[PDB]
Design a protein around this ligand. Sequence first.
Ligand code: SF4
Ligand code: SF4
Ligand code: FCO
Ligand code: F3S
Ligand SMILES: [Ca+2]
Ligand code: NI
Lengths: 545, 262
Amino acid sequence: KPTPQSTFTGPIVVDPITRIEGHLRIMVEVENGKVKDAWSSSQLFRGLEIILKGRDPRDAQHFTQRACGVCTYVHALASSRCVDDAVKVSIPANARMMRNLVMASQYLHDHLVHFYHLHALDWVDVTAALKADPNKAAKLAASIAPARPGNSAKALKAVQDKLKAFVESGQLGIFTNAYFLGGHKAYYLPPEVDLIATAHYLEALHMQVKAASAMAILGGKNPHTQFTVVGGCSNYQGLTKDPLANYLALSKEVCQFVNECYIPDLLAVAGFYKDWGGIGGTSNYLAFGEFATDDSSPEKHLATSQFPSGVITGRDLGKVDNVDLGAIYEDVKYSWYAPGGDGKHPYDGVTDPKYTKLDDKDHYSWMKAPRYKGKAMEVGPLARTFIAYAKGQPDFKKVVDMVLGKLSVPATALHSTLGRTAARGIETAIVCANMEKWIKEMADSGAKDNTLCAKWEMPEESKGVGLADAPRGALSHWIRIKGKKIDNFQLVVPCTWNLGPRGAQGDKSPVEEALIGTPIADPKRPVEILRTVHAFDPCIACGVH
Amino acid sequence: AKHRPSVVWLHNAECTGCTEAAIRTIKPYIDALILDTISLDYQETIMAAAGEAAEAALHQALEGKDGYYLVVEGGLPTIDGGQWGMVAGHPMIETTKKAAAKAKGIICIGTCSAYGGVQKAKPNPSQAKGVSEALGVKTINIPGCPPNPINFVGAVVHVLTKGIPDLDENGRPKLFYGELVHDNCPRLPHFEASEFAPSFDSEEAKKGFCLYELGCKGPVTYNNCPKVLFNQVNWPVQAGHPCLGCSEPDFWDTMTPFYEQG
Ligand code: SF4
Ligand code: SF4
Ligand code: FCO
Ligand code: F3S
Ligand SMILES: [Ca+2]
Ligand code: NI
């Protein structure tokens, strides 16, 4: 070190932000090589909430699932929980277990793909992998990760030979114009680490097929699962012995990769970029919790989630507050919606599109701005991690302390872009550690009694909320039913919390705040913008819907 | 080293479920396809370049001496001169028009690009359109929400090595979309015997009775789902749930309510 940083003063625009879901434009003002102001500008509107009005409430989960195909399943789950609450049905134990296991499978697939296929190219110079000696890289791999055939000299040379033939063809494909071509001051990894990470990148393309096949045993298919119904689930076959044996076996292979490659790569990258523990922090954290033992009501979900719910404000780990679903609202002042729409709780949500022009500082995003008693909230792995750690959740206490010790940093260093990236791995490891217990619970239960859907009745008028903590954080769906039809259906989505624009007070969202202070080593190739933005795991189709 | 055919992949009004589906391919796996078979030259989900460097990669691909095929994911929002869906400051419709102009061939991956999809469903606030309609050209449609990778990769490889596969009246390759879901359904004997589950909690449901009475659209849906499965393990009806008709044009409005035949 020190952290490289130019003298650049002036604007930077990055559009498209690639390696995310959906269409994001980031605009920053830079002064003397650090970002001094930022704007998160979501560039597509579809309008699922408008589309849903007047439709059968049973249909909502099938429309809302298509808010996003990266976080497939999560919206179908949130809609089903939502309608379940509105008709006041408590799902059978087996449906709670099956819905929660499908969420677990979704965490593993999503987090593996994000780290390798979306985030890693911000930290890993693939073309520098060509400079590495494979025997030296194999020795190094022995010193940073579990022993495995895939990290042998022979295996790493084969990867290097494949990459060499590809680069030498002159058709660079997805690496065309990469920020790391020619070297880059902000890229710190030795060529040996580049080679090791690239080898795992390719293995992960295969491993994610297995993670999705696991999810589909219970889900029916991936992407876009088709096993949830009002009152529980449809998938009786999902409770039987052979499908569960295959589900376990596949989940053990995926988890072996998580422990052998993902966590070791993450920690190796974290070790080299320790300065990134001082960049990109925010102050307030929210989670609805996930993996509950009682999903009979949203109240019970919040209370019994094994990854707990909570609200942390101004980094005070000493005061985890309970979630007040009544205190959530959304603003539209800096958004491309009609005026008069600020401060709306989602039961009274309004979605009235009104575009102005590109880069209008008064209206610059298709995302609404969710706020909580006037404050912006960061959601996602980092939020869940701090909340669980603060609450002494033992799996989180252990895995967090392992990471802090390996990196020799205090817990405060997690309030950062490095911490946000580390929290994603931390929770993946913890989900893995729970899979066999959760699968046994459902197998034994389903063996004894295969009840999977409860009876229910459509009310003439009602409302309900469905909560989930999706891979990206706190997800909530809200319905008003009238004449047995959808009167209102509002989605408030994790990326809406993290990446939306300013709220009615002019206050920056979490990603806008996190971008403040970002050093820019090379304005022509502003990878540091990408590092922080990607650490939030953006999904603009989710954010805007 | 031999040239690999250039593929340009555009994302419009989409959920990225079609990109996710494509990478679930196993014959071949996605890495083999892009290292050995095609040159994937623009793809926003996975490409290394961002911003102006990404836009230049696109430019270089569209200007390539050897020409390129186009894959489009998502429909086109057309209200307010195309401005509700933009990339790099340009309306999606405008960029898709530019790319399609010189394309050797156009493959629409998913029901959105093929037919307009979820954003086109009533009341269609973005005035979203399928590609063929937005551009006024015939497209190779690989619909489904999302389609099976088998069908998409199968079509890509066919187009590169054998020409345009035989298409039905809605642009779908007969290889994959020639047969009704229902005609290959293991619950067919129940349907023939009028043995229908009346609800998801019923003994009939537990016994695997036909899901027609719970809204199954398999009898009007062309797709290969029961035959090839998803993820080598399963399909919706095997998991106890009716077919939504998700490979059919405008299914969001023609196949709803999903849990009824009304
Ligand atoms: S066809 Fe379905 S899966 Fe594909 S982009 Fe459209 S909504 Fe998403
Ligand atoms: S479950 Fe659907 S596809 Fe199968 S026989 Fe019955 S109606 Fe046909
Ligand atoms: N995870 C995820 Fe997608 C977002 N934001 C949802 O919900
Ligand atoms: S919903 Fe779609 S994925 Fe196949 S089973 Fe029916 S066509
Ligand atoms: Ca919303
Ligand atoms: Ni998403």
